[PDB]
Amino acid sequence: XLKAIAQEFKAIAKKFKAIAFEFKAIAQK
Amino acid sequence: XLKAIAQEFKAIAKKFKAIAFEFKAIAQK
Amino acid sequence: XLKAIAQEFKAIAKKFKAIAFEFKAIAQK
Amino acid sequence: XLKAIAQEFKAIAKKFKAIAFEFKAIAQK
Amino acid sequence: XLKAIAQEFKAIAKKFKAIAFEFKAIAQK
Amino acid sequence: XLKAIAQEFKAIAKKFKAIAFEFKAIAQK
Amino acid sequence: XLKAIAQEFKAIAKKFKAIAFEFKAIAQK
Amino acid sequence: XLKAIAQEFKAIAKKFKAIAFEFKAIAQK
Amino acid sequence: XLKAIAQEFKAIAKKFKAIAFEFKAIAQK
Amino acid sequence: XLKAIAQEFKAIAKKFKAIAFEFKAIAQK
Amino acid sequence: XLKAIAQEFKAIAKKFKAIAFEFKAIAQK
Amino acid sequence: XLKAIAQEFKAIAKKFKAIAFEFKAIAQK
Amino acid sequence: XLKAIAQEFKAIAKKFKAIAFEFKAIAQK
Amino acid sequence: XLKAIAQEFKAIAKKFKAIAFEFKAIAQK
Amino acid sequence: XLKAIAQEFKAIAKKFKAIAFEFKAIAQK
Amino acid sequence: XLKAIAQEFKAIAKKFKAIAFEFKAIAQK
Amino acid sequence: XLKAIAQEFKAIAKKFKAIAFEFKAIAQK
Amino acid sequence: XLKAIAQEFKAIAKKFKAIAFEFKAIAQK
Amino acid sequence: XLKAIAQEFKAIAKKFKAIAFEFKAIAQK
Amino acid sequence: XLKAIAQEFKAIAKKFKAIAFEFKAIAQK
Amino acid sequence: XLKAIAQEFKAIAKKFKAIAFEFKAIAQK
Amino acid sequence: XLKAIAQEFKAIAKKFKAIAFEFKAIAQK
Amino acid sequence: XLKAIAQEFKAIAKKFKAIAFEFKAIAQK
Numbered sequence: 151x152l153k154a155i156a157q158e159f160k161a162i163a164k165k166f167k168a169i170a171f172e173f174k175a176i177a178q179k
Numbered sequence: 180x181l182k183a184i185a186q187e188f189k190a191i192a193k194k195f196k197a198i199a200f201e202f203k204a205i206a207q208k
Numbered sequence: 209x210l211k212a213i214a215q216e217f218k219a220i221a222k223k224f225k226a227i228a229f230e231f232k233a234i235a236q237k
Numbered sequence: 238x239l240k241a242i243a244q245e246f247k248a249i250a251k252k253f254k255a256i257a258f259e260f261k262a263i264a265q266k
Numbered sequence: 267x268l269k270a271i272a273q274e275f276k277a278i279a280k281k282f283k284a285i286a287f288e289f290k291a292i293a294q295k
Numbered sequence: 296x297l298k299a300i301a302q303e304f305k306a307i308a309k310k311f312k313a314i315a316f317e318f319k320a321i322a323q324k
Numbered sequence: 325x326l327k328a329i330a331q332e333f334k335a336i337a338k339k340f341k342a343i344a345f346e347f348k349a350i351a352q353k
Numbered sequence: 354x355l356k357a358i359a360q361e362f363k364a365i366a367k368k369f370k371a372i373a374f375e376f377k378a379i380a381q382k
Numbered sequence: 383x384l385k386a387i388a389q390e391f392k393a394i395a396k397k398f399k400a401i402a403f404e405f406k407a408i409a410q411k
Numbered sequence: 412x413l414k415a416i417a418q419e420f421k422a423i424a425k426k427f428k429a430i431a432f433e434f435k436a437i438a439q440k
Numbered sequence: 441x442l443k444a445i446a447q448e449f450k451a452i453a454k455k456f457k458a459i460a461f462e463f464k465a466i467a468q469k
Numbered sequence: 470x471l472k473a474i475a476q477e478f479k480a481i482a483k484k485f486k487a488i489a490f491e492f493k494a495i496a497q498k
Numbered sequence: 499x500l501k502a503i504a505q506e507f508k509a510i511a512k513k514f515k516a517i518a519f520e521f522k523a524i525a526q527k
Numbered sequence: 528x529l530k531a532i533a534q535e536f537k538a539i540a541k542k543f544k545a546i547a548f549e550f551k552a553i554a555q556k
Numbered sequence: 557x558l559k560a561i562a563q564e565f566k567a568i569a570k571k572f573k574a575i576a577f578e579f580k581a582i583a584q585k
Numbered sequence: 586x587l588k589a590i591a592q593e594f595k596a597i598a599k600k601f602k603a604i605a606f607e608f609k610a611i612a613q614k
Numbered sequence: 615x616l617k618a619i620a621q622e623f624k625a626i627a628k629k630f631k632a633i634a635f636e637f638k639a640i641a642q643k
Numbered sequence: 644x645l646k647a648i649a650q651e652f653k654a655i656a657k658k659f660k661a662i663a664f665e666f667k668a669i670a671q672k
Numbered sequence: 673x674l675k676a677i678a679q680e681f682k683a684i685a686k687k688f689k690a691i692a693f694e695f696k697a698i699a700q701k
Numbered sequence: 702x703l704k705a706i707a708q709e710f711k712a713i714a715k716k717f718k719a720i721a722f723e724f725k726a727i728a729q730k
Numbered sequence: 731x732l733k734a735i736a737q738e739f740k741a742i743a744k745k746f747k748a749i750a751f752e753f754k755a756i757a758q759k
Numbered sequence: 760x761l762k763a764i765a766q767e768f769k770a771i772a773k774k775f776k777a778i779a780f781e782f783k784a785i786a787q788k
Numbered sequence: 789x790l791k792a793i794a795q796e797f798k799a800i801a802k803k804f805k806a807i808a809f810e811f812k813a814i815a816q817k
Contacts (some may be wrong), residue, residue, distance in 0.1 A: 170188030177181030334372030351355035453485035460478030518536030525529035567607035634652035
């Protein structure tokens with residue numbers, strides 16, 4: 151396990167926030 | 180959108196982080 | 209938990225169709 | 238594309254509903 | 267369950283691989 | 296970007312297939 | 325909330341453990 | 354010390370983890 | 383180390399400041 | 412409360428900030 | 441330092457006694 | 470809880486006094 | 499240049515940090 | 528203080544380092 | 557940048573005036 | 586001193602503002 | 615500029631030299 | 644210290660004179 | 673050595689420092 | 702200045718002290 | 731070394747002429 | 760002053776050049 | 789100062805005459 155699943159969801163949540171932040175940059179430019 | 184896409188993906192990132200957190204909490208339990 | 213997990217996945221599925229919808233808009237214009 | 242993304246994320250949302258549904262049964266029994 | 271969840275996650279992973287693929291193509295054109 | 300987008304989605308796909316694998320294991324034991 | 329409070333408390337508990345682990349190395353060295 | 358300091362910090366970390374779990378429990382209630 | 387310790391405590395202080403912020407919010411509602 | 416709690420946490424965060432600063436100084440010299 | 445850090449932890453301990461004291465009243469009323 | 474929170478903060482404050490006193494000694498010798 | 503100016507500014511920044519570190523010693527004593 | 532002077536000098540040292548960083552960035556540009 | 561350079565020099569000028577004002581205090585006491 | 590240093594830092598801060606201002610003109614034209 | 619920048623920097627260097635001189639005298643006396 | 648501070652300021656003055664001289668050159672070309 | 677020459681050079685070096693420190697008194701007065 | 706003259710004389714004194722040092726070193730050799 | 735002595739005497743000579751050059755100013759003003 | 764001092768030190772500097780020159784010859788042969 | 793300067797100069801003159809005397813001797817042997 152469960153621990154690996156939880157930490158991996160944490161990691162993919164971080165990646166999704168990075169993606170969110172990313173499209174915002176293109177949205178401006 | 181393009182602002183909507185970024186804020187959306189941020190919301191999904193937050194929800195995934197919450198899921199990760201909940202799985203971590205239930206892992207020890 | 210489990211109940212919160214299932215409830216939050218419903219929200220995630222809801223938000224993804226909004227993603228689909230918003231890329232649908234940019235697919236045209 | 239842009240059509241592929243819109244059609245594809247719709248399938249993603251449809252799937253996540255199925256996971257949510259399955260977790261509902263897991264919560265019960 | 268639990269197996270159906272694994273199959274759904276595998277399918278979602280394949281879908282996101284396809285999306286990543288498609289983004290490489292659209293990034294050039 | 297858009298190379299960042301494709302890379303992030305490729306990583307997300309890999310992480311999801313890892314989760315699928317993990318759930319395959321937890322389904323057994 | 326109250327999720328956030330438990331969240332930082334767990335995180336800070338981990339960080340204190342990291343500090344303890346670290347100072348042990350200086351204790352040996 | 355330093356060993357006493359390290360085990361002490363470990364004790365504070367464990368107490369904070371317990372408090373985290375405590376707010377996690379009280380959050381629903 | 384010692385620099386890691388200093389960075390770790392900086393992070394701890396930032397977390398505590400944000401949670402003081404949070405407790406301002408919970409004080410209201 | 413609850414305002415006293417928040418003020419106390421602000422002070423505590425300030426003190427860890429100073430402590431973190433101080434280990435940076437002692438680390439060099 | 442080293443005197444400053446030791447002097448500071450005494451203040452931190454005093455602050456935690458006050459916060460605990462306050463949660464004692466919070467538990468009552 | 471609330472009582473457990475308050476009593477555990479008493480313990481934490483007690484640990485911090487020991488840490489302070491311990492740093493005092495090592496600051497001398 | 500422009501490289502020489504940047505390097506000189508970096509050196510000046512280092513000397514100021516050294517001065518900062520130094521004054522703190524006079525502050526303690 | 529004399530503490531304020533030292534922390535001020537540290538801050539301006541950081542500022543000068545950032546300025547040097549900026550001329551390094553623009554030097555190649 | 558060039559805007560960042562000018563803006564940062566404004567902060568530098570602000571800190572040096574504070575240093576002046578601080579040294580004046582010592583000149584009195 | 587002490588008065589001389591406080592007076593001189595005032596002039597230095599005044600100058601740095603002029604440099605900042607001139608860099609504003611450089612930024613435009 | 616650009617000559618004004620160089621002139622102001624030379625003046626600042628002169629003033630810093632004066633301050634440095636003064637500090638040697640105050641260090642003895 | 645105080646002599647170290649005086650030496651540091653003399654070095655800073657020399658560095659600023661060099662930077663001013665460099666800007667004199669870049670002003671021409 | 674020769675010794676007398678070096679000793680007298682050191683003496684006159686001290687005398688010049690005295691003269692320098694003397695001149696500064698007239699410099700303000 | 703007079704301050705320039707005073708620091709000039711101090712430089713002379715330092716040079717004479719260095720000469721004395723050198724003559725002392727060569728005297729034993 | 732002998733060479734250092736000869737070089738340093740040249741420095742002494744060029745500082746003395748600066749002394750004279752500065753004196754002629756105070757001769758008038 | 761007042762020309763007396765300046766021209767006198769001017770002759771002193773002129774002499775010291777000859778002394779420097781003569782130790783230059785001594786260093787060779 | 790002005791008188792102190794006056795005897796300082798005559799002391800320097802006497803010391804220089806002693807140096808000349810010493811160099812006359814070392815010139816011989």
